[PDB]
Amino acid sequence: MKKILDSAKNYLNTHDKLKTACLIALELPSSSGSAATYIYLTDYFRDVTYNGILYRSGKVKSISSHKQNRQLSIGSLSFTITGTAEDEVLKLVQNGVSFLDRGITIHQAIINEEGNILPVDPDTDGPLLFFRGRITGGGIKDNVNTSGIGTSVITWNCSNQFYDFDRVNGRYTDDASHRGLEVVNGTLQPSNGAKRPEYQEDYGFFHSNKSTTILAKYQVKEERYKLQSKKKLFGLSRSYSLKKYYETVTKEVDLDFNLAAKFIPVVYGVQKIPGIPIFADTELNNPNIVYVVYAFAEGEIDGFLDFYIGDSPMICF
């Protein structure tokens, strides 16, 4: 329940003819990420000043309906510009320009008798928010009729942060991915692709490629290249059947053809997880003493409660 000022609760109950305007503020698609230019637009017939920002009129034509269910889904919205402005057309059809992560905020403003904005939102003492998200898509539709009236509509597509549902954001256990290596002139140099600028001089995952093969020498013929599945049970819903759901659950995965088994999990609370080797080597004069490094979990963990050397924990039940 988004609380509304009691002052607005009187206007929304007494007045029947409500003059509403939608204030749009979208970031300009720019070739580079430098600076942050904003185009401010409105659906009202006259320009509307909000927080000193002049939302110019005459461009926006229509806005779609924002629908939200109780199942996680992208919240799609579609607002259309006139398409005959010829100054908005070039911004959309410009070459070498990307708007992958450009945002947009839309306000729902109610105009008074004197032409001002009726305060509704208690925290801001201003208008409500209709939608705020990201720009994912776009298009223009030219329709030249050989006899009659033609139309052109520029439609911008909007959604929330989960627009790319097929996106795997994870720190794969590899040097090339951890430091964001990229060939610059003739060498693989760390770049800004790393999730942190301090990851550029982190060689922790340098020997992760040969760790499994070296470790396999000191294992049984079985379990030579294997690892337990990080998550055993994942959830039974209407997308599965009993037989299929309980047959899909696996115990161990082969590491020589499963690149998804080398991702670092994140654990909240007390849970049992396998360890992914990232280093394995013996001493020089004592070859039977082997150091092997296993990377458990991600982030600052509280600690390790117990270690299962084989299938038997060090602290007995």
Partner: protein, 105 residues
Amino acid sequence: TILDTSESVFKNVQGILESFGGAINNLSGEYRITVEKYSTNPLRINFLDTYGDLDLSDTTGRNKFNSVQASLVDPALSWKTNSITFYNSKFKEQDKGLDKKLQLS
């Protein structure tokens, strides 16, 4: 919880939810997390306050069950699976003794 990071962000969020209810909502600008609850002061809607349309739909079949069977990874066992099964005599006294089981994990 264990979040297999090799999964998609969308599916990971969808899996974190449905474990405690939850519904991420992007309406009114912010991201709002809402869970199912009971309140003693709900909002009163009369049908005369609506636009006149009304659609009632009760799909008792395929959605109404008399007993539940669930499973979980229980550290009481060696992190194996334990089954929780119980019946309800009232719900089977209703529905004319039909046997309908809810399967959960």
